[PDB]
Every structure is written in C-alpha cells, then in structure tokens.
C-alpha cells in the first residue's frame, strides 16, 4: 500500500584465478593488539607480546596447488627496519619509535615489500587457516600514543 | 580560554510516512562477499556460495501494516539476466561475465527493477529484520577482476 | 564598526512543472571513470569496465506520474555509433577511437539524441534514484590520451 | 630548445583592512539549488527547501574584532518583498513569481539592501565559517523556467 | 621504462595552537541518523531516538589545559528554536517542521550560535573522546522528506 | 508525457598505454591529515604523525611489467627542502614554516620533482595497492593556520 525509499547496499568482492579463495572475514579484518606499556618498549629491538590473526582460505583445490604463502605490503618504519610497519592513525596522536611486526607460522618477522612470501603451508581440500602473529617493535625509546597500522597481503599458490 | 576551529559534522537521515523505519545500520551497508575462484564460475548459470545481509526495520506498528516487502533497483548485466547486478567499480579492473544476484528469504532471485517486491514478511511491534542473501552469478566463462556492485532498495508496507 | 566588501554568490536552479525534481547533486555531476589500458580497447566493439552514477529525483508524487525515464543528448563519435559519446577536452590531448557509452538499468547503451528514453523506472513518493552505468567503447585501435566527455539529460514523466 | 608562447594568467584578489579575510573559495562561489516543482510554489509566500552555503573567514584576529556579520545586496523582486532576490539569467526562459531568499543562521530572511546585517557570529582565532541557507520564495503562482540569481555581500567586523 | 600520468592527491589539515588536536576522523564526519516515522514526530516538541557520535582529541597535554568544551554552529530552524538545526539538502525533497538537535554528555540541547559551549570534560594525556548525541526535533506536524543537516564545531580548551 | 530538462553529467578519465591503470578512486583523492599542534612542530626538522594513503592499480599485466614506482610533483617549500610540499589554501590563513612530506613504503620522504621515483613494488595480475604515508614537516617554529596541500603523481612501469 505504502512504499518508501529504503537505502543502498554495496557489495564488495573479487573473482580470482587461483587454487583457493580468501574468506569474506579475512579480506578486511581488524586486529586488536590492546595496550602496551612504554616500560616494555624502552630500548631498540624490544618486542611486545604477540597477538594472533588468521587468513582463511576457502574452496581449496590441492590438485591445482599444494602450498600457499602470504606476503605483506606496507610502509616500513625505517630504512634499517624493513620488517616493521609504520604507525598511521592521524597527524597528532601516535606512538614514536614503535612499529608493528608480522610473524609467520615459523615465528620470523616478514619484510613488508610485497615480494617476500612467508613459509609455505600445505593445503587440504576445503577450508585452510594460515596462522600469523603481530606484535609491537621498538626502534628506540617508545613514547605514548595511538599505535594503529595497516597492511595488505597477497597469496602465492604453488 | 583558547578556542580553535574543530571541524564539521554532517547528519544524514530521512523522514518517512510508513509503518516502520529502516535502521541507521541498514540504510547504507556494505556486504563483503569475499573472493570466488574463476573455476567455480566457468559456465553460464553458475552460482557461488551465498552471503547473507539484513535490512532492519525499527519502531514497527502492526496497527499500520502487518507485512513488509523489499524491491531492489540496480543496473542489470544483460537483458536476458534481469535479476543479476552488473559490476561497477572502475574502468579497468572488473570481472567479466560475472554479476551479483540478490536472494530473498524464499531463495528466489529478485528482479532489479524497483517494482518486483520480495516475499512479504510478517511484522511484529518493534524491531524487525528481513533476511537476504547475495551470491555471484556467471553469464559465461568468468574472468578475474574486482566484483563490486551497488543497488538501492525500497520497502513496501501493506 | 569596520565594514569591508566580501564577494559574490551565484545561485543556480530551475522551476519545473513535473512530477519530480532533480536533486542538486545530480543536475551537474562529475563521473570519474579512471584510467583504462589501450590493451583493453584494442579492437572495434571493445568495452571497458563500467562506472555507476545515479540521477536522484526528489519530492516525487505518484499521483502526478508513476514512471520516469531519462534520455541523453551529446555528440556522437560517428554516424554508425550513435550510442557512443565523442571525447572533448581540448585540441591536443585526447584518446582516438575511444568513446563513452551510457548504460541504463537494463545494461543497454542509450542513443545520444535526447529522444530515445531509457527503461521506465517505477517511482515512489519521496526520493528516487535512477541507476546508470558509463564505460569506454573502442571504435578501433585505441590510442593514449585524455578521455573526458559530457552530456545533458532530460527526464520524462508518465 | 624550442620556446613557444604559452598564454595568459589573471590573478584576482583584494587587500582589506579588517579583522579577517574572506577565503579564495568564498569570494565568488556558485550555489546549486537544484530543481523545484511548481506545485511546491503554487501560492504567495510558499517556500522551498533550503540549500546551505558558507562564507569562510581566514586569519581572524580576535584582538581586532570578535563578531562578524554579513549583509547581502541584490535586486529585489518587488517593493513589498525586499528580502527576495530577483531572478536574472537572460531575456527569456526565466521563472516568474519565483525568487531567492538568503536565510541567516537564525533562519530569518535577510534584507537585500547592503545595510541590514545578519546575526553577529562569534569569531575564533584562525579559520571561521558562517552558515547560510538559500531557498526559493513564491510571490504568486510559480511558472516554469530558469531560476538563476546573483548577490554580493559585505562583512562587518565589530 | 613506461611512465604515465597518474593523478592528483589533495592533503587537508590544520595547524592549531591548542592543548589537543582533533582527530583526522573527527574533523569531517558523517552521522547516519537513519529513518524516523512522521508518527513519532506528530506534534511540536516531539523528539526521536538519539544517535551517538564522538569528537576525538589527540595528543592532549593536561599541563596546557585540563577541560575541553565544544560549541556547534549552524542555521537554526526558527527564532524560538535556536538549538535545532535546519535541514539543507536541495530545493526540493526535505522534511518540514523537522530539525536536528545536538546533545552534549549531559543530555541538554546546545544552542547553535557558535559561542555556547557544552559541558566541560576533563582531559587525560593522550586520546580523549567527547560523547555527543543527535536526535530529531519536531516544530509541528512533521512531513516526509530528506532530513540532511550540516554543522561546524569549535573546541575550547581551559 | 511531461518531459523536462534534467541537467548535465561530465565523464572524466584517461586512456593509457601501460601495464596497469590507476583506479578511479586514486586518480583524484583527498586525504585528511587532521589537526596538529604547533607544540609538536616547534623546531626545524620536526615531524608529525603519519597518515596513510594508497594508489590502487587495476588490470595489471605482469607480462608487460613486474614493478611499479610513483614520482610526486609539487611546489617545494624551500631550496633546502626539496621533499616538503608547500602549503597552498588562499592568500591568508595558511600556516608558516610547515609543509607536507610524502613518505615512500621504505619510510623515506620523496623528492617532489616528478623525476625521483619511489622504491619499486612487485606487481601481481589484477588489483595492486601501493602504500604511502603523509606527515607534516617543520622548517622552523610552526605558526597556526590551514595546512592544505596538493601534488600530482606519475607511475613508472618496468
């Protein structure tokens, strides 16, 4: 009887030519690292506790590819720390001398060039979960502030 | 003492003469369908796994109306596929022979003309959620690319 | 106390005896198609990915009219391609053998003469948005250059 | 090295002895009102929906002045409607019985004599923005046509 | 080897001499009020449900200032309702007798004169978020339409 | 029946002979730096917190090129600071001794001559995202004011 305007729906997705497809919950996931004390990042090379995040793969076909690796891309904090993400929230409130390190399943920090892939993980037919960890890395004496960071990843099927 | 310029706030809303009001989280929502392999859309009529999204109606009054239906409006991929959304992100990166198909609570695909309303759902006083599903539809051999799409919906109360 | 002259303000608008009124954001809008590779437009009939744009109608009264259609009027690239917009930015830099195609909600290219109206969209009282898509159309081997174009539209109410 | 003629650049500006300075984007701005229906302006005194626009003040010094007001100057539509702008685009095609009203931040229409100043908004050090609204005013039965208008403003500092 | 023109990037920001700095996500934010029924705004003085939004301050120094207040500036709907924002989207389609009220942390509606600051909130070193609410206010029998509004705010530190 | 003039639509884009094409959302994008305090920019060489932005590439073909680099072009603040964007808003109200630095994915600031390309990022078939950061740079004691800036970029494929 009465018809009114409702609104808009935006659909996001991608068609890939690969052995697996990234889950809808892994393409744009947010990782809450929590707070970290300055006393825990009081020197160069100091690290915080790790926070785990996963990249799920769906509809995997082991006949097409047997192993999958992930390479992360982002802004590095320095020219001597290529495996540490630079913080980026705003222009005023952000921690200095602090970055974010992404660790593959072997526990090694991945360099953020978009070309160095992590350790290959064998795939099974179906749903695959690749484990990663993230932590704060101190390039000096840390100062308080926001510690948000962003990165993109690509998956290599071989 | 010290007063500085802060910024600007924009308020978006609508006043409707209807039995229900669309929730602020449903008037403009993003649905992340994730990725789909090209191998899963290798023929005309192929479909992917469905992703659900809801349209929430607030402050519903059953004395005004008891049933609600939703009609979507968007560009169609072809004249032979009038229930398949055409992808629209940019001029370079997009999947070909692929479209987004919107499913109502009965599993049928809705016509994207803004005049074919979904199955009517009984309303109760207060908050009502109308379930919907979105998937990918292949009008041929799919090719890799971005698969973003947009559509608008209206709500009919009777 | 101190009075100085500030400037000038210009107001643009129209009064129409129609069922709806075009929104202020739709009477003069810019659509960013983005870049497209010459490799994707390497032959006659080649098309690019589509970019969407909407023409919003406000204060619609379904008693006056229930269906709305839109015709477009611009310079055609050729007499054998009457649905392709010719590019026009300057005298030096522009793409050759490239045009702009406007697609209505059925996915069909519209003739650019201001007399071939698109598919009639059902109207509801209040805000109405009519979806359109724009893409690049190759009338030959495309060559690099700017690809700016423009057109005027008129709305038919019945 | 080939040297060719390039063209001409014209610089516009003004040196003011005032507390603030009008932004380069506010000295000459175009306000797009959109379309309005004759049915919404079918009687004397009928108003349309308002469209907002701002006049921005830069480099404000509160030590010189603390309050700024704006007076608008233009051709009135009648002797009994001195706060309604007369339309002016060309000798034909303009709307009759329609005018433009500039609304203060208190919602009151401003007299278009260049001497009635608006509400005195309080200034802060730095960028300052004064909100304004423009709407269509019907002095009779509105007729279709173009509804362009122009006005000039001066800023009072005290 | 192949160099092409990419595009343009625009950087927006402000340098302030204040105890805090407004976050990049708070200087220009959109608040989605959602829809409201005319039945909920059927009389003068009727209010809708509130939608919350925050203004975030970064790099706060409690040594410089301990309390922060926010004053909003915009066009008032009338002269008796100086705390109700006037709607402004286009010349047609907006709601009538409907406004937007901004409520501070104490629930009181703020006068939109740009000089009546909200309740003082104590600042802590680092990130501070000031809670605000926005609701709909009826100045009579509400009529259907778009209900967009805009306002600017300034932050006082003392 | 009733046909009225609707308005104008302008299509903007480019045809490029390159390995990738810049996304429509990256050809002309506005990034919000936010506010920054003069206390954080109180000396030459002082920097602010970084704000990230991306240049998305679409329809990438790794058979044409495997790496992409971006060079930015704009007005430098001084002769000794060739990698700091000069602020440009208007004849009044801008900040002094403040500029914008665009940081490569390696964390280094880029020279703004349109010929110093950033570090190459490996490309994959399909959508590619190149990360960048923007911050404020002080060439002296910063003064309050607006801090808007502009720059153009070009992409090298090799």
- Secondary structure (DSSP) of F30-95: EEEEEEEEGGGG-STT-B---EEEEEEEEEE-TTT-SEEEEEEE--BS-SS-TTSEEP-S-SSSB-
For chain D, helix (H) and strand (E) counts, in that order, are 0, 9
Chain F closest-CA separation from residue E57 CA (Å): 9
Instruction: Note whether E36 contacts B: Cβ–Cβ < 8 A.
Output: yes
- Tallying the residues shown for chain F, one arrives at 158
Task: Please judge whether D58 and F90 are an interchain contact, meaning their C-beta atoms are less than 8 angstroms apart.
Answer: yes
Cβ(B77)–Cβ(B86) under 8 Å? yes
Data resolution in angstroms: 2.7
Instruction: Collect all residues of chain A within an 8 Å Cβ-Cβ radius of residue C124.
Output: 3-5
F127 and B93: CB-CB below 8 Å? yes
Dihedral sign (CA A23, A24, A25, A31): positive
Enumerate neighbours of B (3 or more CB pairs within 8 A): A, C, D, E, F
Burial category of A92 from C-beta neighbours within 10 Å (exposed 0-12, middle 13-18, buried 19 and up): buried
Scanning E53-72 for CB atoms below 8 A from F yields: 58-59, 61, 64
* Nearest in space to E102 (alpha carbons), one of E122, E86, E80: E86
Give the helix/strand (H/E) hosting E96: strand E96-103
3-state helix, strand and coil shares in percent for chain D, rounded to the nearest 5: 5, 40, 55
| Paired residues of C34 in beta bridges | F13
A3 contacts on C by Cβ (under 8 Å): 124-125
Give the number of other CB atoms < 10 A from CB of residue F83.
Answer: 20
d(CA B3, CA E17): 9
Bridging pattern class, strands C98-103 and C126-139: antiparallel
CB distance from B28 to chain C under 8 Å? no
Q: Measure in Å the smallest separation between the Cα of C32 and chain F Cα atoms.
A: 5
The experimental method behind these coordinates is: cryo-EM
- Residue E11, classed as helix, strand or coil, is strand
Query: What is d(CA C134, CA C113) in angstroms, rounded to the nearest whole number?
Result: 17
Strand partners, D58: D21
Chain E: nearest CA to F27, how far in angstroms? 4
Closest-CA residue to B114 (of B65, B70, B56, B54)? B70
* C88-to-C79, D7, F34 alpha-carbon distances in Å: 17, 21, 37
HSE-CB for E93 with a 13 A CA cutoff: 31
SS3 C20: coil
Cβ proximity of D70 and D130 under 8 Å? yes
Angstrom distance (rounded) from CA A144 to CA B97: 51
- Three-state DSSP class for residue E62: coil
The partner residue sitting opposite E32, judged by closest CB among B28, B59, B61, is B28
User: Rounded to a whole number, what is the distance in Å from the CA of D23 to chain F's nearest CA?
Assistant: 6
> Chain E, 94-133: which have a CB under 8 Å from a chain B CB?
95, 98, 100, 102
Spatial CA neighbour of B13 closest among A61, E37, F18, D69:
E37
- Rounded to the nearest 5°, which phi and psi values hold at E101? -110, 130
How many CA atoms are closer than 13 Å to the CA of B53, on its beta-carbon side?
A: 23
Burial of C158 (0-12, 13-18, 19+ CB in 10 A): middle
CA dist D97 and D143 (Å) reads 7
At B75 the three-state DSSP class reads coil
Segment (H or E) for F156: strand F149-157
CA angle E51, C26, B118 (to 5 degrees): 60
Nearest in space to D128 (alpha carbons), one of D47, D61, D30: D61
Check residue A60 and report its DSSP letter. Answer: E
Cβ pair B40, B123 in contact under 8 A: no
SS3 B41: helix
What whole-number distance in Å separates Cα of residue C83 and Cα of residue A52?
A: 54
* Structural contact between residues C69 and E103, judged by C-beta atoms closer than 8 angstroms: no
Spatial CA neighbour of E63 closest among E156, E129, E121, E126: E126
Nearest by Cα to B8 from D129, D104, E128, D132: D129
d(CA B119, CA B108): 9
Specify the length of chain A in residues.
Answer: 158
Using a CB-CB distance cutoff of 8 angstroms, which residues of chain E are in contact with residue C58?
Answer: 89-90, 92-93, 146
| C-alpha to C-alpha distances, E15 to A33, A124, E70, F144, nearest whole angstrom | 30, 54, 18, 5
Residues A153 and A118: beta-carbon distance below 8 Å: no
Residues of E in contact with A146 (CB under 8 A): 58, 127
Angstrom distance (rounded) from CA A105 to CA A115:
18
Burial degree of C119 (CB within 10 A; 0-12, 13-18, 19+):
middle
Separation CA C59–CA C17 (nearest Å)? 12
Dihedral over alpha carbons E62, E63, E69, E73 (to 10 degrees)? -120
Residue F130: burial class (beta carbons within 10 Å; 0-12, 13-18, 19+)? buried
d(CA B88, CA E158): 50
DSSP at A80: S
Whether chain A has a CB inside 8 Å of the CB on F40: the answer is yes
Flag whether D touches A (3+ CB pairs, 8 A cutoff).
no
Integer Cα distance of B149 and B110 in angstroms: 15
> What's the CA gap between D6 and D56, in Å, rounded?
34
Out of B16, B27, B31, name the one closest to residue A11 (CB). B31
CA distance C49 to C39: 13
H-run or E-run covering A99:
strand A98-103
- Inter-CA distances, A130 with A56, A68, A111, Å: 6, 9, 17
**Is the CB of residue F93 less than 8 Å away from at least one CB of chain B?**
no
Q: Answer for the pair C123, C62: CB distance below 8 angstroms, yes or no.
A: yes
CA separation for the pair C93, E107 (Å, rounded): 59
F53 chain-A contacts, CB cut-off 8 A:
none
Closest-CA distance, C22 to chain E, in angstroms, reads 8
d(CA B95, CA C80): 28
Give, in degrees to the nearest 5, the angle at Cα A123 between A118 and A127: 110
Cα D154 from Cα D68, distance rounded (Å): 10
CB contact under 8 A, C149 and F16: no
Cα–Cα nearest to F38, from A96, E13, E123: E13
Q: Which of the 8 DSSP states describes residue C94?
A: -
Residue of chain B with shortest Cα separation from D127: B5
Short-list B93, B142, F6, CA closest to C135: B93
- Among chain F residues, the shortest Cα distance to B94 is held by F59
Cα dihedral: F108, F109, F111, F117 (round 10): 50
């Amino acid at each position: 009887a009465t018809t009114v305007n409702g609104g808009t729906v935006h659909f996001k997705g991608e068609v890939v030519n690969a052995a697996c497809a990234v889950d809808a919950g892994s393409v744009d996931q947010t990782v809450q690292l929590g707070q970290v004390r300055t006393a825990s990042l009081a020197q160069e090379g100091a690290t915080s506790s790790a926070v785990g995040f996963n990249i799920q793969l769906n509809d995997c076909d082991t006949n097409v590819a047997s192993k999958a690796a992930v390479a992360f891309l982002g802004t590095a904090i320095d020219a001597g720390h290529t495996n540490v993400l630079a913080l980026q929230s705003s222009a005023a409130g952000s921690a200095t001398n602090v970055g974010v390190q992404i660790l593959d399943r072997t526990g090694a920090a991945l360099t953020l060039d978009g070309a160095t892939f992590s350790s290959e993980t064998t795939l099974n037919n179906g749903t695959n979960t690749i484990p990663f960890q993230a932590r704060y890395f101190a390039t000096g004496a840390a100062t308080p502030g926001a510690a948000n960071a962003d990165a993109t990843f690509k998956v290599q099927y071989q």
